[PDB]
Design a protein around this ligand. Sequence first.
Ligand SMILES: [Mn+2]
Lengths: 267, 266
Amino acid sequence: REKIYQWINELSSPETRENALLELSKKRESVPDLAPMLWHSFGTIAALLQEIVNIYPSINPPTLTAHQSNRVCNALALLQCVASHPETRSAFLAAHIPLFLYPFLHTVSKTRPFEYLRLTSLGVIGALVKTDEQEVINFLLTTEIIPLCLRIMESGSELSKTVATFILQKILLDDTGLAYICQTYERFSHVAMILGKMVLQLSKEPSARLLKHVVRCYLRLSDNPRAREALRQCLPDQLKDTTFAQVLKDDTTTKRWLAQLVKNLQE
Amino acid sequence: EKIYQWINELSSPETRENALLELSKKRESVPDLAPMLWHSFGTIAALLQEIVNIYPSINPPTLTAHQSNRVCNALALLQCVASHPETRSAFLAAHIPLFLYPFLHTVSKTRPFEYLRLTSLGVIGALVKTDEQEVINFLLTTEIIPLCLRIMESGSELSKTVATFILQKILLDDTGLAYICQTYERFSHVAMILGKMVLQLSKEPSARLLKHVVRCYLRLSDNPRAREALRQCLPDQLKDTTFAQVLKDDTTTKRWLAQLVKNLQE
Ligand SMILES: [Mn+2]
């Protein structure tokens, strides 16, 4: 508790806010109640959003430096902290704070500063949907986060693609999210096409976590009657062959899922 | 039925620009447009997209009259959501005004930018007009005061006026006054800006600006401990016959300028 209070308090005057963001960002894992402390502290959340908003112009044209990205990501780590705490989770959603991260998620630059910015931003969202609250899914649906996730799964770093897919997975898990993605052949096909190319490169450049999420997504889509029908024709061969046999020999969960997916298709 | 139609067309970039234009001019004629717009986070998100699509126009500064007028139409809609008593609170909990801070931070003097900044301050001014404690508590944790102080001395007539009005409503609130006097730094910078203002106001006068300026000094004179500082920094033009002409019409402003002198007398 020692320095935690002082640092939190120091997040005020921009003269000592940088050190506080850093010191706090690292001690986060420890202090289990940091989230409510951050949230309930006067002007602290605003200070964090201030950090986010300050770099909006450097995001496009893409001139964000490593230093800018690191400091803002410190703030984002504290927001992720606030996003997954049971006592602050729901209010975090009321504040529509995730809407402050979307411009970050829209960037496409490849430099590490941007990739780190996007990965950390995705971490906040992933922690938001970790508990399946109906309201968070409906929030993400209506704010158009899906297309942002799709592009990233489609051309981001392996790390970022994993979290983006996990987010799409959570959205798909809920009945509303599943029905929304399958409402038109075009929206389903867009998602299926992306998961498709993911299943092709993953077969030559393996990735356990990513492969696990891609399988869950496909499995979940097989719950919708029309997507199931479509998948009867468009489910990539690599998911039916034995191509993933070896790598799955250790991940019993995902293997069980792929078996269920193949079972669901056809009749 | 057309209001509902356009509102729905905002959530489609294909039909948004048109909807913004229609809903903006139709603003004054639709009572609860705010609750209608806020009825769906989707609508708000779309309105914020318009604001976000403008950040790329900052450094290098390339904002065009067309881009400015378009986003400002979106600001007009955010402003009415900021005014309505049914939505003003949710608007604040989402820190929506912060999306406008990058705009308020620009310094380009081209009309596209000046107008963007004027319109943005207008969103803030509509917040403080409500006279909510909720609003002042929000702004104090945002850095709006420094942003307003810069414009108060470098902006155009209209901008300087809206910026000074915002500070005025902040100072008028007890906590706002206390906040500003809480430190030498804060008070000193405010005192300095008001100073440069009355100076360039003597030459090239402005009835509206002066009233807001005078009102800020009067309210500052409400804090006992500040009075000594106030006595020492008060510009001559406020103590002499200047403005006496300009103030022939302002019975209110001179009545205020009178109370100011009286508060500072030892
Ligand atoms: Mn559900």
